[PDB]
Structure 1
C-alpha cells in the first residue's frame, strides 16, 4: 500500500511514534519518504552482504528480520521480513522502534543521515493536524 502524507502521519502518531526516543513524527516521516516513498511493498537487494531491505522503513534482513535467505542473519525484531511488506504497518513500526533502541538511534539509516539529519523536515507534517 502507498500511504498518503497525512494518512501516514496520523497513523504513525496513533502507533506512538511521535517523540519515540526523542525522534519527532516529522523525522519518522522524512525517513519513510526517502526509504520507500510511503510504499509498504518497497524492497532493495544488497549484493555485497546478500541481504534485503524491506518495507516502508527498509528494514534489513541481516539483523532485524528473517527472510530465510540471508547468511549470518539475526532476527532482532523476531519476525518474518514478509510481515514488513504488509498494508497494516503495526509490525513495521514495532520493529522500527526496536532498531532505534540500539545506541546509534535513527542514524542507523544512511538515507536519514543524508537526507533528513540537520535539515528542516517540517514540510512532512505541516497541514496534517498532527
Structure 2
C-alpha cells in the first residue's frame, strides 16, 4: 500500500505514534516520506547484506528475521515480511521499540539527515487529524 501524506499521518496517529517518546507526528510522517515514500512494501538492501523493510525501513540486522541476514537478531520477534503489510500495525509497534532503545529517532538515517531540526509540523498541515 502506498499512502497519501495525510492518509498516513491519520493511520500513524490511530496507532499511537503522535508524540510517542516526545516525537510529534510530523517527525514520523517526515521519516516515512524519506525512508519509503509512504510505501508499505518498500525494501532496500544494505551493504552488509541486511535489508530494510516497510514504511520506516526497519533493518533485519537487529529487528526482524528474513532468513538471509546471517548472525543478525530479531528483537521485534517478527518475520521481516510482517513490516510490508497494508496494515501498518507491525511497523508502528516495532518502531515504538526501536525509538525507545536509547538513540531515539536518530536510529533512522533519513530522520537524522532530513527531518531532525526542521519544521516537521508542515508534514501534518492540511490533514484532518
Q: If the TM-score is normalised by the length of the shorter chain, which range does it land in?
A: over 0.9
Report matched runs for 1:36-115 at 5 Å: 36-47=36-47, 49-115=48-114
TM-aligned CA deviation for residue 14 of structure 1: 1.0
Runs (4+) of structure 1 exceeding 4 A deviation are: none
Structure 2 stretches lacking a partner, 5+ long:
none
Please tell me the root mean square deviation across aligned C-alpha atoms, in Å.
Answer: 0.7
TM-aligned CA deviation for residue 24 of structure 1: 0.4
Counterparts of 1:112 and 1:123 in 2: how far apart (Å)?
15
Counterparts of 2:72 and 2:34 in 1: how far apart (Å)?
25
What secondary structure sits across from 1:98 in the alignment? helix
TM-score computed with the length of structure 2 as normaliser: 0.97
Structure 1 stretches lacking a partner, 5+ long:
none
Counterparts of 1:42 and 1:93 in 2: how far apart (Å)?
15
TM-score computed with the length of structure 1 as normaliser: 0.96
Number of residue-to-residue matches in the alignment: 129
